[PDB]
Amino acid sequence: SDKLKEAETRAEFAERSVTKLEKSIDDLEDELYAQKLKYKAISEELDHALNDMTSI
């Protein structure tokens, strides 16, 4: 009985940890996507600048 209780508690702890880790990794992926979006926006602005500089 003692061993079973220990195992059950370990399982609950690990499950909660996996839930937290999944949420955190999803949030960090969202943040990386946002920063990539900003980089792409300024890169397209610079590409337009280069297109005009082709006439420069």
Added chain:
Amino acid sequence: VEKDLNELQTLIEAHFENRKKEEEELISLKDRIEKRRAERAEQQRIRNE
């Protein structure tokens, strides 16, 4: 200085194109990433159900 400007703008457009391909690859990476998020979400939800 003219041919310098020419080669420099050439390499400028070149790395433009290169980093652009890299950004396309990274966008496709983000897309398959969101596919992975959705598939993990649905399979996790099935498991939880």
